[PDB]
Amino acid sequence: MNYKKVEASDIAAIKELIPAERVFVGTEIGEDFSHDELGSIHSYPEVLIKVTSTEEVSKIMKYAYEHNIPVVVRGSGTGLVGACVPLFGGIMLETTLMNNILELDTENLTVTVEPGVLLMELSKFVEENDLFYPPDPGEKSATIAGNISTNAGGMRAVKYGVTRDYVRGLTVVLANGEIIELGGKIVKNSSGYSLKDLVIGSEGTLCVITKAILKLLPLPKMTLSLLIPFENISDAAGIVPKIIKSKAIPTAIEFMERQTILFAEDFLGKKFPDSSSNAYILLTFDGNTKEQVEAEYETVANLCLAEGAKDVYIVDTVERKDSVWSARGAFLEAIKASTTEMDECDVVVPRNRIAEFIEFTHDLAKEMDVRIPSFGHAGDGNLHIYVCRDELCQADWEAKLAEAMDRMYAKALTFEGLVSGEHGIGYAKRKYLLNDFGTEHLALMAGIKQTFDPKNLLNPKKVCQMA
Amino acid sequence: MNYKKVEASDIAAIKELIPAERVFVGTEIGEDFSHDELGSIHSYPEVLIKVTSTEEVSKIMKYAYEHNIPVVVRGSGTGLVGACVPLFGGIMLETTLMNNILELDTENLTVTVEPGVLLMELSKFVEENDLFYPPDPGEKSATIAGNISTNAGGMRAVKYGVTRDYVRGLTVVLANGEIIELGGKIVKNSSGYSLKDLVIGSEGTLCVITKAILKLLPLPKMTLSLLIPFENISDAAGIVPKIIKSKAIPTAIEFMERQTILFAEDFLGKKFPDSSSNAYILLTFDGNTKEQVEAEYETVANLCLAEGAKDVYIVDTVERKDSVWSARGAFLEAIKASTTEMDECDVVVPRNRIAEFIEFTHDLAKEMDVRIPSFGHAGDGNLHIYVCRDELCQADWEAKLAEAMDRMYAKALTFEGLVSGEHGIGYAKRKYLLNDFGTEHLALMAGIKQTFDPKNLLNPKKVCQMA
Amino acid sequence: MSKILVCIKQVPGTSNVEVDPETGVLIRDGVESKLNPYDLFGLETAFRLKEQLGGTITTLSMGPMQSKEVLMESFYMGADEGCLLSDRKFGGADVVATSYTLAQGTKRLGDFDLIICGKQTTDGDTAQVGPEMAEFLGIPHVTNVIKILAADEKGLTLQMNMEESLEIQRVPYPCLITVDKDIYTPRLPSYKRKLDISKNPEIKILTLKDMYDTNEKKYGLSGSPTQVERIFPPESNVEKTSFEGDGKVLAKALLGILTEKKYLG
Amino acid sequence: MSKILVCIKQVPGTSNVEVDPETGVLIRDGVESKLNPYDLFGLETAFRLKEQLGGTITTLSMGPMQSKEVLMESFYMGADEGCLLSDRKFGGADVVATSYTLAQGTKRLGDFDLIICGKQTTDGDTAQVGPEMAEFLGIPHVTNVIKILAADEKGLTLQMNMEESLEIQRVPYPCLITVDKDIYTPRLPSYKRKLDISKNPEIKILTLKDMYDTNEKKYGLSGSPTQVERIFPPESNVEKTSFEGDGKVLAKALLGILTEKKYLG
Numbered sequence A, B: 001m002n003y004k005k006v007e008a009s010d011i012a013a014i015k016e017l018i019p020a021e022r023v024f025v026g027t028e029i030g031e032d033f034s035h036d037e038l039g040s041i042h043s044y045p046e047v048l049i050k051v052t053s054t055e056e057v058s059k060i061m062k063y064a065y066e067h068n069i070p071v072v073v074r075g076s077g078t079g080l081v082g083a084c085v086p087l088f089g090g091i092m093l094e095t096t097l098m099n100n101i102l103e104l105d106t107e108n109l110t111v112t113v114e115p116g117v118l119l120m121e122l123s124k125f126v127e128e129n130d131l132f133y134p135p136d137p138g139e140k141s142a143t144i145a146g147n148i149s150t151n152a153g154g155m156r157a158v159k160y161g162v163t164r165d166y167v168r169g170l171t172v173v174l175a176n177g178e179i180i181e182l183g184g185k186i187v188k189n190s191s192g193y194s195l196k197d198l199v200i201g202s203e204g205t206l207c208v209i210t211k212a213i214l215k216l217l218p219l220p221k222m223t224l225s226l227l228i229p230f231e232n233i234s235d236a237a238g239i240v241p242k243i244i245k246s247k248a249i250p251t252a253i254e255f256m257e258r259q260t261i262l263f264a265e266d267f268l269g270k271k272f273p274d275s276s277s278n279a280y281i282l283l284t285f286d287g288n289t290k291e292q293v294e295a296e297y298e299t300v301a302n303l304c305l306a307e308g309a310k311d312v313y314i315v316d317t318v319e320r321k322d323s324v325w326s327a328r329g330a331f332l333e334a335i336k337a338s339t340t341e342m343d344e345c346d347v348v349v350p351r352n353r354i355a356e357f358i359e360f361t362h363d364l365a366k367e368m369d370v371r372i373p374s375f376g377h378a379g380d381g382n383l384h385i386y387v388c389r390d391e392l393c394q395a396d397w398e399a400k401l402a403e404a405m406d407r408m409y410a411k412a413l414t415f416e417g418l419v420s421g422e423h424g425i426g427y428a429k430r431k432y433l434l435n436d437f438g439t440e441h442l443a444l445m446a447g448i449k450q451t452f453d454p455k456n457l458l459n460p461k462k463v464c465q466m467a
Numbered sequence C, D: 001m002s003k004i005l006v007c008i009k010q011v012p013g014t015s016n017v018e019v020d021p022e023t024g025v026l027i028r029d030g031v032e033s034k035l036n037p038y039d040l041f042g043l044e045t046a047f048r049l050k051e052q053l054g055g056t057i058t059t060l061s062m063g064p065m066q067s068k069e070v071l072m073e074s075f076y077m078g079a080d081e082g083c084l085l086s087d088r089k090f091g092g093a094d095v096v097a098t099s100y101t102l103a104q105g106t107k108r109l110g111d112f113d114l115i116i117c118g119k120q121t122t123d124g125d126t127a128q129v130g131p132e133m134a135e136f137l138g139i140p141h142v143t144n145v146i147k148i149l150a151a152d153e154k155g156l157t158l159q160m161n162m163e164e165s166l167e168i169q170r171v172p173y174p175c176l177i178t179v180d181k182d183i184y185t186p187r188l189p190s191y192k193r194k195l196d197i198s199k200n201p202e203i204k205i206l207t208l209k210d211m212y213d214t215n216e217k218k219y220g221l222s223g224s225p226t227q228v229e230r231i232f233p234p235e236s237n238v239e240k241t242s243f244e245g246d247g248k249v250l251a252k253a254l255l256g257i258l259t260e261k262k263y264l265g
């Protein structure tokens, strides 16, 4: 709808606002900017601009609003749902040159970052100052504003939460070029509508984040892990309400079945330390002294042995921790190395319905003759489920992928869960959001994007757009 | 605008939808429903309806939408900014008959409540089941959906947060009568725009909350408090970053000066246990064993004594806690008993700017010759500030109240804080929200209310309206 | 004035107590024991007199070796020295044997110008160890003191209350006083005073060998005239009664209830 | 087979170590000491042989009384009994005196069909206590075992690796073996075994009085031929060098660097 193609007069007017070494046109774009880690959709932008400041972003958004050109913001290109792909091919704003950490407030325990600070270099910076950024998505090369725009969460969400719980303030640029400050270094907020909480999870469809203020915690010193074998995944997922109600809250609660562990053993070349069982619970406790960590895990280990665990294995050493957590950290790459291609599902369910959904994917894998390996976080209900193509031909794979994905998203609808808990909706999961939420629920989302972006220029046909 | 006044034919059509025992017209509406605890504005609704179900609310919102009648939802009438006052006098939905706790999920650690469950009876119910609802606003007779709509926070926000951090799901009714489910019993959420986080803090201007799912924690067994005298409020506010960075996070951090304590001594008739100092820090630690709390408080008490504290007093027994916390719990009533009338302010500032703002109100009270007592929560920056009229004449009081409020809201703007951190904006603080945020910031808020409520019926001229 | 003795007791940390129907021993929820709040007013009354007269303050307790914690707790509030009366032959005592071993431990510790007992305990509630202790010492005693008007170096001017009057007395030294609830606000135990090294004064423990009357017939259960026979929960009943029919039909029912509860109204 | 001895050592919990320029002693960050990861492969090699042959497993350690923790740690992994060699006369030892007191403690504990030492420690890195210990015992030894092909009740068929070859040997009992890194994945210490008694075993401590050669000239610092003179951080330097000018102008600079680092390419 009404989108003006970028012509040579628009290249000259853009190169007056931006230095020409940060503007890329045509054959100097690169194939990496035509896609993200979804891999299904490919679409080149017409202009790639590597912005460096808030006022440079606002001058581009003023030009694209005046000349009716769509704009897609891009971080590291890491997201898995096609959210940063420019389907209409307009301006692509690229933020990895704004990788400066602007301020570390040790009085308020906040850090001010630019969009494009990587998660691996922010968490390295704050831990040198004995501080802690708790959200840990699995890919550390992600842009921080990409984590804010996708509401990226990870392993520590059972104790600490997700990126939404640690965004204190945002400086955003709207589609017409207006610069808006949203939060601040405050802690309590009850002044008006929380526009900051709309930007968290919006996936670049409302505004362009040009500054972020992140809440930090004091860094825990000690860390100890527990490995608890179980007979099946029903006994493993059922111990999680008893663990949390014993007031010894783990930092991470991970379930892994034996079939997923056999992939990581073949990929890494090393065996798992004990794989005489079918299901596992991998805990993590943190603290500041060795004695209060020891009181935490011995509470859960005396508990877990009383409800049918075969054993409790203490993982207390940096060599023992690397022998267990590099197997968990290589679950995704071991599944990729075993197949031709795959597709990812990241449904979140209620926590008491984890075991029934994992057992459902085992009955679905036997029925459709596809390999469906799965893992996830047993402390919050997010399950990472993969449908592997293996050796199916292209016609039989597209029919089997569409049937396996439809039945898993319909079963999570019956279980009163959602479509995505980590990765977002983007382009790939739009029709499952229209199946979960009604048309009246998505008309509220589309009317909010019409408020922030009435010309529909900031990322068209994403999340709610054409569900 | 052109709102339709309620006539006698609308009374008959309402009494077909609602039984007539719960409809109040004219003189059947008491004087308590014409105001809330702000006390400045007074306005009667034309119909008072005590609703009992979600489908009864949706039938009323369907009737008022097609007949252009404004609707104001009311909880306990406890809010302090005029947010539940029906300025145009249409339908008043009153939710205190929906006081049923629907479900306690001990597996997911959630509780499902109706709007109108009081805070004093939810926290009593979950603590009988060894669970914990962490947000503690100062008034316990408030409804839960009143706490959600105002984003009500309190004493435990330094460790646990506010009402926003514990709302898992909401069932809302829009202005046209559509019923929308927003969250669920899930933990992680990255599916679409967070419409649930817009309702939290919206003060009844977007939709009518008809069900809530609240996140619970395991209840801590023990509790111990500390009373730390200081020389002035600058030394008292400055210890709070050193306390939090020592990894012993208190449950509550309260500052109180001597002139506020002298009010509570005259009100309660009992002296404070030690008032040989000018400023105080009142801490609270919680835990499960006595040795865990003892390692927490001895860490901070050694830290306070090494950083210029005059003493550290241990408040460990029930009678000692009731000698100190009944003084803090009666700060608001002691200020009201000492004046003819007052008007209040709940600015939040950055935590390192607490002492500069408290010292600013002492210079402002000395210059304007008004009494400005103040206290607040030293762990998050929220300052409860009261301007007393004492014996001023009516023309001199409105001139001194306007000057003292304008200079305090402008100084919190210079300190990069906000207008309200607890109580909300409502009707009273609309002008200061237009001074803090720009016109482009409030046009985004007004365009969001136009999405949820296009005919402008749900609580008009409040928060982001006529600012 | 000068030497001041304060008798403090360790009590159960909460009084929410019920009995098993056939154990005969109380169902105390835990053992988080504390100093009783009525003796905090007795400690605070000694602290105001020490700030005016400049003497010393001794704390005295009778119980097991677990009762050394409330002697250390009184040290953190500002007591100068303490004394435990721990012995196996002292247990099982009633008021008559408790006030005898507290008066025997007082004579062993020397002379005191003033002994300050609290109003009552929270487990016994008998409120009569104080008047019985001053009988064995032979000193005058005044109970239920709400106010100290004068604090002369020879004696005190006190305000002893009744249910409806205020007696003002001038009692000389040596004497016992029994303060009641809310005479002052008691100060909190300081962590700075507990960070010295442990406690400046050492809890001097006394047994039956140290007393001037070393004969076990007057102490413990042997010197107790009373004994508990059985302990049982109190029978209470809630009856909801309604009264309609206006006029003096309700006024006779309200006067019939107010006279049955002896209000005579 | 049947009787199996495993020599384990307590090491610093991390090797991130720097020296103070004029203390002469190691700037160790803390003391969260652990069992060394190279001896976890030696313990795991004994566990696979016990599951095939059914004998017993003894753990042996030499150090202070703090080294009793890694003997209890090997018990949680599945060792049957342990033995500490704690004595003041054993400290300050080099490899020659450590392998002598470990061989003297082996003869005191009886005969073993197989002694399993690890590849090296993480503090000494000398990797030579094992071959020196089997010299004092007089038994054959095979170092750097990556694979056990056969586990007969009289001897083992081993795969000893070199830098470029794989020697396959048939060594009989009694003998010492030295396994290297990643022969198996070591099992984790079980918490269920920790709750047995504290553990069933009860570490048997030996001093110089218990050895069959009770003469302190051969133990400790007196029997050490070597000694440290000074310890210092290694001098490393990062030099960024650039090379432009294409053709074989860069290829002579790349061959000049690969031959200076002895790659010969």
Ligand SMILES: Cc1cc2nc3c(=O)[nH]c(=O)nc-3n(C[C@H](O)[C@H](O)[C@H](O)COP(=O)(O)OP(=O)(O)OC[C@H]3O[C@@H](n4cnc5c(N)ncnc54)[C@H](O)[C@@H]3O)c2cc1C
Binding pocket: A036, A037, A072, A073, A074, A075, A076, A077, A078, A079, A080, A083, A084, A095, A115, A136, A137, A138, A139, A141, A142, A143, A144, A145, A146, A147, A149, A150, A151, A152, A153, A154, A202, A203, A204, A205, A207, A208, A209, A210, A332, A422, A423, A459
């Ligand atoms: C191996 C792997 C593991 C992963 N593990 C996890 C995981 O555990 N948890 C998890 O949550 N996610 C995970 N992810 C995906 C996760 O979403 C991305 O890692 C990250 O959130 C996206 O950041 P980016 O910088 O990569 O963003 P991009 O993909 O470039 O951007 C993602 C979205 O953010 C928008 N965006 C980016 N920058 C801005 C900005 N400044 N303003 C507005 N919008 C902006 C883009 O337009 C797009 O909408 C994983 C991905 C991979 C490949």
Ligand SMILES: Cc1cc2nc3c(=O)[nH]c(=O)nc-3n(C[C@H](O)[C@H](O)[C@H](O)COP(=O)(O)OP(=O)(O)OC[C@H]3O[C@@H](n4cnc5c(N)ncnc54)[C@H](O)[C@@H]3O)c2cc1C
Binding pocket: B036, B037, B072, B073, B074, B075, B076, B077, B078, B079, B080, B083, B084, B095, B115, B136, B137, B138, B139, B141, B142, B143, B144, B145, B146, B147, B149, B150, B151, B152, B153, B154, B202, B203, B204, B205, B207, B208, B209, B210, B332, B422, B423, B459
């Ligand atoms: C003495 C005192 C102490 C207080 N202390 C604190 C404090 O410490 N922290 C704090 O945050 N607040 C405090 N408050 C005020 C606090 O806002 C209110 O106590 C409470 O949040 C309002 O709840 P209510 O049930 O009283 O709501 P009402 O005033 O009736 O409603 C408040 C707002 O919520 C809306 N609303 C109510 N129910 C619904 C519903 N179902 N759907 C949609 N909108 C709804 C109303 O329309 C109005 O917008 C205090 C108030 C008093 C009087």
Ligand SMILES: Cc1cc2nc3c(=O)[nH]c(=O)nc-3n(C[C@H](O)[C@H](O)[C@H](O)COP(=O)(O)OP(=O)(O)OC[C@H]3O[C@@H](n4cnc5c(N)ncnc54)[C@H](O)[C@@H]3O)c2cc1C
Binding pocket: C007, C008, C009, C038, C039, C042, C060, C061, C062, C063, C093, C094, C095, C096, C098, C102, C116, C117, C118, C119, C120, C121, C122, C123, C124, C125, C126, C127, C128, C129, C130, C226, C228, C231
């Ligand atoms: C259920 C129950 C009922 C009892 N009924 C009786 C009864 O009817 N008659 C009777 O003679 N005994 C009775 N006793 C025994 C007696 O009351 C207590 O067992 C014990 O002697 C504690 O004394 P008290 O609580 O009466 O002290 P109180 O007279 O209640 O206390 C007065 C003050 O004396 C001081 N004091 C009291 N006890 C001590 C102590 N041990 N060490 C130091 N200072 C102390 C304190 O300053 C205290 O404030 C009863 C005991 C129990 C458990």
Ligand SMILES: Cc1cc2nc3c(=O)[nH]c(=O)nc-3n(C[C@H](O)[C@H](O)[C@H](O)COP(=O)(O)OP(=O)(O)OC[C@H]3O[C@@H](n4cnc5c(N)ncnc54)[C@H](O)[C@@H]3O)c2cc1C
Binding pocket: D007, D008, D009, D038, D039, D042, D060, D061, D062, D063, D093, D094, D095, D096, D098, D102, D116, D117, D118, D119, D120, D121, D122, D123, D124, D125, D126, D127, D128, D129, D130, D226, D228, D231
């Ligand atoms: C910095 C430094 C440099 C040294 N350099 C030398 C040197 O050049 N020459 C020399 O002779 N000594 C040297 N020593 C002394 C010696 O290496 C150690 O002090 C000590 O004897 C530990 O032996 P190791 O680390 O060499 O054992 P290694 O030979 O590295 O370990 C081989 C195996 O022997 C067993 N083992 C080793 N030590 C013990 C023990 N104490 N108890 C039980 N089992 C054990 C384990 O199974 C281990 O895996 C040095 C020490 C230090 C600190």
Ligand SMILES: [Fe+3]
Binding pocket: A153, A154, A155, A376, A377, A382, A384, A422
């Ligand atoms: Fe995940």
